């Protein structure tokens, strides 16, 4: 009779009240995705990020009272990538000191993967944060004269350092040329398309660098600010 319906409405109110509390946490958190080729250093960045601030691999950390949630999904023909169309940013890790290794060249495989990711039907809004990992190996490779980049890449012969290229403190002129060559090689694909909806942020990363989390925080803040500015047509 009507006695049963009286208790049924009580169950709805308890559940509906609980959903309100869970909405606040969900709306006040940021999700990130880790991508990259194998043997690049994805887990190495995770270990440093996890320890300092606290199937599938997930990580929770907090910076400046802001909730952050990072997950790693770790195989061509990716069908599951359509789910990650609402994340704040995509973190791309590439080993820049592996141009001479074949498994074609590993760097060329990374470029192909990045180009495939950039021009995707679902990822037409999500920005990309790019980490050029393993810098000291590349510096050591360039410092000694052997296995020149021109041998594996022919465009390196007709490349010169850009005018607005800030050198590293005390770095030799040879390593900077190769570093910025690789950086613009990745940036060309990003600037070739996009229509201003998403941008790419490059960085130079090592295994011992500790300022990575600050870079991620600043880039996320800039991404959100630019999204709001574009929405208000104030850019």
């Amino acid at each position: 009779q009507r006695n049963e319906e009286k208790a049924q409405r009580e169950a709805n109110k308890k559940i509906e009240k609980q959903l309100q509390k869970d909405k606040q946490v969900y709306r006040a958190t940021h999700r990130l995705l880790l991508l990259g080729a194998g043997e690049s250093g994805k887990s190495t960045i995770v270990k440093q990020m996890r320890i300092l601030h606290v199937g599938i691999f997930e990580t929770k950390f907090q910076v400046d009272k802001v909730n952050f949630h990072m997950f790693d999904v770790g195989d061509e023909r990716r069908k599951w990538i359509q789910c990650f169309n609402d994340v704040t940013a995509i973190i791309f890790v590439v080993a820049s000191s592996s141009y001479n290794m074949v498994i074609t060249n590993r760097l060329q495989e990374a470029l192909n993967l990045f180009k495939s990711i950039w021009n995707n039907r679902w990822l037409r809004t999500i920005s990309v944060i790019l980490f050029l990992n393993k810098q000291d190996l590349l510096a050591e490779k360039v410092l000694a004269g052997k296995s020149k980049i021109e041998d594996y890449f022919p465009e390196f012969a007709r490349y010169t350092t850009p005018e607005d290229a800030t050198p590293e403190p005390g770095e030799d002129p040879r390593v900077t040329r190769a570093k910025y060559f690789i950086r613009d090689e990745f940036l060309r694909i990003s600037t070739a398309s996009g229509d201003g909806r998403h941008y790419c942020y490059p960085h130079f990363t090592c295994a011992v660098d500790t300022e990575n989390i600050r870079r991620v925080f600043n880039d996320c803040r800039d991404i959100i600010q630019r999204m709001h500015l574009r929405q208000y047509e104030l850019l």
């Binding site: 607005d164 941008y199 790419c200 600010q225 630019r226 500015l229 208000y232």
Partner: protein, 284 residues
């Protein structure tokens, strides 16, 4: 027979104000996609302009055309109270929208936590209450009436409808209605412009080789120019003819007030240019 044409033009003003605001009202409520925090402020502004066009303008047009007031003294006082209420409650919403945008852009991480539906409703209620406290109370309690003999004869006559106030009430109403929101709006939009310029400079410094703040300039300029050019000239004479009498003729006063009126009709064009709004309008 110039007046007969002057009637024709005015009627278009009344119809345009009513027609423009009703589309904004129906689209927001009918469609659940558009129900956001800022759309509540937009709905409040649209409702205020709707009340303007429905109640205030037609009676003023009738008074201008017939050169007499047939309703009576109580109804003319009520009409003046409604006019002040709806003018005061329409300007103060623009300041709310400006502050909302400032919070959204300057501090994006705390924007989600700071403002919710409850705070938005509280702010809207507070704005409407403050606007009501300025118009109905000082008018119905008879604290604004002047002292000179012409004003006394005007109040005594039941077929005359004019507006006479002393210095204190005119200054207080002007300061509460127009001057205070202006400085806040200017500061807010200057800060937003600086933030946009900084972001554009950073983008240019990042990938300038592979690829100046005109969009932000135009977007801010449209709003500031329209609001100022609409409501600035009126709120100068309003104090000018009160501090020193016998400087401004009446026709100037009515012309400036009616010029300030049309901002109510111009607002929806400015504040409903979103692609979702265009899609909703095309659907209807």
């Amino acid at each position: 027979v110039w007046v007969v044409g002057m009637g024709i033009v005015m009627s278009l003003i009344v119809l345009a104000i009513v027609f423009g605001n009703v589309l904004v009202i129906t689209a927001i409520a009918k469609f659940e996609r558009l129900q956001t925090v800022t759309n509540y402020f937009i709905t409040s502004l649209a409702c205020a302009d709707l009340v303007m066009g429905l109640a205030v303008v037609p009676f003023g047009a009738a008074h201008i055309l017939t050169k007499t007031w047939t309703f009576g003294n109580f109804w003319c006082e009520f009409w003046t109270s409604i006019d002040v209420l709806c003018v005061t409650a329409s300007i103060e919403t623009l300041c709310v929208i400006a502050v909302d945008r400032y919070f959204a852009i300057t501090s994006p991480f705390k924007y989600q936590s700071l403002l919710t539906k409850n705070k938005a409703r509280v702010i809207i209620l507070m704005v409407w209450i403050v606007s009501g406290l300025t118009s109905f109370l000082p008018i119905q309690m008879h604290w604004y009436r002047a002292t000179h003999q012409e004003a006394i004869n005007c109040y005594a006559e039941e077929t005359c409808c004019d507006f006479f106030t002393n210095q204190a009430y005119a200054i207080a109403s002007s300061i509460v209605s127009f001057y205070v929101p202006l400085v806040i709006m200017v500061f807010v939009y200057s800060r937003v412009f600086q933030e946009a310029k900084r972001q554009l400079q950073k983008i240019d410094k990042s990938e300038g080789r592979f690829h100046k703040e005109h969009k932000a300039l135009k977007t801010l300029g449209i709003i500031m120019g329209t609001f100022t050019l609409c409501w600035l000239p009126f709120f100068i004479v309003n104090i000018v003819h009160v501090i020193q009498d016998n400087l401004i003729r009446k026709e100037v006063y009515i012309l400036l007030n009616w010029i300030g009126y049309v901002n109510s009709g111009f607002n929806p064009l400015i504040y409903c240019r979103s692609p979702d709004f265009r899609i909703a309008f095309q659907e209807l």
